Design an enzyme around this catalytic site. Structure first.
Site, PDB file in Angstrom:
ATOM      1  N   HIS B  42     -50.204  56.280 -29.289  1.00  0.00           N
ATOM      2  CA  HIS B  42     -50.635  56.723 -27.967  1.00  0.00           C
ATOM      3  C   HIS B  42     -49.917  57.971 -27.514  1.00  0.00           C
ATOM      4  O   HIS B  42     -50.507  58.798 -26.827  1.00  0.00           O
ATOM      5  CB  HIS B  42     -50.465  55.629 -26.910  1.00  0.00           C
ATOM      6  N   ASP B  88     -50.989  51.239 -32.673  1.00  0.00           N
ATOM      7  CA  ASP B  88     -50.254  52.273 -31.973  1.00  0.00           C
ATOM      8  C   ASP B  88     -49.256  52.808 -32.984  1.00  0.00           C
ATOM      9  O   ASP B  88     -48.085  52.420 -32.977  1.00  0.00           O
ATOM     10  CB  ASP B  88     -49.527  51.674 -30.768  1.00  0.00           C
ATOM     11  N   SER B 185     -41.336  55.552 -25.653  1.00  0.00           N
ATOM     12  CA  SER B 185     -42.451  55.376 -26.581  1.00  0.00           C
ATOM     13  C   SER B 185     -42.307  56.249 -27.818  1.00  0.00           C
ATOM     14  O   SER B 185     -41.809  57.368 -27.733  1.00  0.00           O
ATOM     15  CB  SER B 185     -43.782  55.714 -25.893  1.00  0.00           C
ATOM     16  N   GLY B 186     -42.764  55.742 -28.959  1.00  0.00           N
ATOM     17  CA  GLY B 186     -42.675  56.501 -30.196  1.00  0.00           C
ATOM     18  C   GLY B 186     -41.320  56.322 -30.845  1.00  0.00           C
ATOM     19  O   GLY B 186     -41.156  56.538 -32.043  1.00  0.00           O
TER      20      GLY B 186
HETATM   21  C1  XMD Z   1     -46.994  47.647 -14.097  1.00  0.00           C
HETATM   22  C2  XMD Z   1     -47.093  47.201 -15.567  1.00  0.00           C
HETATM   23  O1  XMD Z   1     -46.231  48.053 -16.418  1.00  0.00           O
HETATM   24  C3  XMD Z   1     -46.707  48.494 -17.637  1.00  0.00           C
HETATM   25  O2  XMD Z   1     -47.192  47.769 -18.488  1.00  0.00           O
HETATM   26  C4  XMD Z   1     -46.595  50.026 -17.802  1.00  0.00           C
HETATM   27  C5  XMD Z   1     -45.332  50.401 -18.659  1.00  0.00           C
HETATM   28  N1  XMD Z   1     -45.059  51.875 -18.675  1.00  0.00           N
HETATM   29  S1  XMD Z   1     -43.529  52.419 -19.263  1.00  0.00           S
HETATM   30  O3  XMD Z   1     -43.591  53.950 -19.407  1.00  0.00           O
HETATM   31  O4  XMD Z   1     -42.472  52.077 -18.187  1.00  0.00           O
HETATM   32  C6  XMD Z   1     -43.132  51.674 -20.806  1.00  0.00           C
HETATM   33  C7  XMD Z   1     -43.756  52.151 -22.064  1.00  0.00           C
HETATM   34  C8  XMD Z   1     -43.450  51.568 -23.340  1.00  0.00           C
HETATM   35  C9  XMD Z   1     -42.484  50.454 -23.441  1.00  0.00           C
HETATM   36  C10 XMD Z   1     -42.121  49.819 -24.716  1.00  0.00           C
HETATM   37  C11 XMD Z   1     -41.164  48.730 -24.774  1.00  0.00           C
HETATM   38 CL1  XMD Z   1     -40.736  47.986 -26.321  1.00  0.00          CL
HETATM   39  C12 XMD Z   1     -40.545  48.252 -23.524  1.00  0.00           C
HETATM   40  C13 XMD Z   1     -40.861  48.831 -22.253  1.00  0.00           C
HETATM   41  C14 XMD Z   1     -41.827  49.941 -22.154  1.00  0.00           C
HETATM   42  C15 XMD Z   1     -42.180  50.575 -20.884  1.00  0.00           C
HETATM   43  C16 XMD Z   1     -46.244  52.747 -18.957  1.00  0.00           C
HETATM   44  C17 XMD Z   1     -47.691  52.202 -18.681  1.00  0.00           C
HETATM   45  O5  XMD Z   1     -48.627  52.950 -18.960  1.00  0.00           O
HETATM   46  N2  XMD Z   1     -47.836  50.868 -18.136  1.00  0.00           N
HETATM   47  C18 XMD Z   1     -49.221  50.315 -17.874  1.00  0.00           C
HETATM   48  C19 XMD Z   1     -50.090  49.816 -19.081  1.00  0.00           C
HETATM   49  C20 XMD Z   1     -49.310  49.283 -20.374  1.00  0.00           C
HETATM   50  C21 XMD Z   1     -49.671  47.843 -20.880  1.00  0.00           C
HETATM   51  N3  XMD Z   1     -51.117  47.424 -20.675  1.00  0.00           N
HETATM   52  C22 XMD Z   1     -51.983  46.884 -21.792  1.00  0.00           C
HETATM   53  C23 XMD Z   1     -53.403  46.495 -21.572  1.00  0.00           C
HETATM   54  C24 XMD Z   1     -54.177  45.992 -22.677  1.00  0.00           C
HETATM   55  N4  XMD Z   1     -53.659  45.851 -23.952  1.00  0.00           N
HETATM   56  C25 XMD Z   1     -52.340  46.203 -24.194  1.00  0.00           C
HETATM   57  C26 XMD Z   1     -51.470  46.717 -23.174  1.00  0.00           C
HETATM   58  C27 XMD Z   1     -51.625  47.607 -19.252  1.00  0.00           C
HETATM   59  C28 XMD Z   1     -51.400  49.028 -18.635  1.00  0.00           C
END
Ligand code: XMD
Ligand code: CA
Lengths: 51, 235
Positions: B42, B88, B185-186
């Site tokens: 991503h 990913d 990420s990455g």
């Molecule tokens: C409010 C809910 O929060 C989320 O999930 C966020 C997290 N951040 S982030 O930049 O701090 C972020 C990005 C990667 C990470 C990897 C690890 Cl191992 C641990 C913490 C992380 C936090 C970025 C983001 O884009 N979101 C919203 C997203 C991310 C997860 N989703 C999925 C939906 C369907 N399938 C899979 C996943 C919903 C929306």
């Protein structure tokens, strides 16, 4: 055998051959002459923290 | 990287950093060879054009050892999809070779069956990056590392809000305010075994940052080995 006793006493990749272990290493190393340990070829080998 | 420790000198030599035209480091990566970098699929979205920086342990003070690198070709894993975050994974081949100095070395790739049985069954893993030090705080200045415990292939799925697929894997805490976060990420999820590190996973996603009853969702690296090679050979 039993590449699960203590990793077949290998340093890295552990492999089984019906009756015993058979070690090998990540690309960049060379297997010691004792079939277990792995020694690097170049000076900056994968997996090692440049300390 | 909420919490965690500071990647001391020559402690996280594989830590690659994807920067953009604004020289801002948005995503991360892992060095696999003098020519290749491993990154979360991503990630190739939070930018327009990107450079790959290495050797840096501080985003504001020349450490002399850093170095920028341009991407020659980007290998995104076709079947990826934001809507689910499945597959990913991606691979960048540098235009020029990386030169292993201190703070700059490549991490090892393990053998699938070996990894899955010894690397992942291991107690904990290593996750690092320059990402946020809190769900809301600003990105990080220094390079941080947080040792994270492996998560139950099941508890994982339960705590989630979305399918934890084949190519996924949990890692982190259920209540401890420690976990990778934005910008991370990455990044490289490595497992250490006998003073040598293996690339076990990629920083994929999570729901928030260091949240309770929620974990960090990584990319099961061993679920793409043969792909990654096919890639080191370019394809
Ligand atoms: C409010 C809910 O929060 C989320 O999930 C966020 C997290 N951040 S982030 O930049 O701090 C972020 C990005 C990667 C990470 C990897 C690890 Cl191992 C641990 C913490 C992380 C936090 C970025 C983001 O884009 N979101 C919203 C997203 C991310 C997860 N989703 C999925 C939906 C369907 N399938 C899979 C996943 C919903 C929306
Ligand atoms: Ca610098």
């Amino acid at each position: 055998k039993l590449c699960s006793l203590d990793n077949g006493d290998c340093d890295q990749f552990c492999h089984e051959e019906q009756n015993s272990v058979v070690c090998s290493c990540a690309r960049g190393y060379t297997l010691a002459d004792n079939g277990k340990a792995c020694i690097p070829t170049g000076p900056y080998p994968c997996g090692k923290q440049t300390l | 990287i909420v919490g965690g420790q500071e990647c001391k000198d020559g402690e996280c030599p594989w830590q690659a950093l994807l920067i953009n035209e604004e020289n801002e480091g948005f995503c991360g990566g892992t060095i696999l060879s003098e020519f290749y970098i491993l990154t979360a699929a991503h990630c190739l979205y939070q930018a327009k054009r990107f450079k790959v920086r290495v050797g840096d342990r501080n985003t504001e003070q020349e450490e002399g050892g850093e170095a920028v690198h341009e991407v020659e070709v980007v290998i995104k894993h076709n079947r990826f999809t934001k809507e689910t975050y499945d597959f990913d994974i991606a691979v960048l081949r540098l235009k020029t070779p990386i030169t292993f100095r201190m703070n700059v070395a490549p991490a090892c790739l393990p053998e699938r069956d070996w990894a899955e049985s010894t690397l992942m069954t291991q107690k904990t893993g290593i996750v690092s990056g320059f990402g946020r030090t809190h769900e809301k705080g600003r990105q990080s200045t220094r390079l941080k590392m947080l040792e994270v415990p492996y998560v139950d292939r099941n508890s994982c799925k339960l705590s989630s809000s979305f399918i934890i697929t084949q190519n996924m894997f949990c890692a982190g805490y259920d209540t401890k305010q420690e976990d990778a976060c934005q910008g991370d990420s990455g990044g490289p999820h490595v497992t250490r075994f006998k003073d040598t590190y293996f690339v076990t996973g990629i920083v994929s996603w999570g729901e928030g940052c260091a949240r309770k009853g929620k974990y960090g969702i990584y990319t099961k690296v061993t679920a793409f080995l043969k792909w990654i090679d096919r890639s080191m050979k370019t394809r």
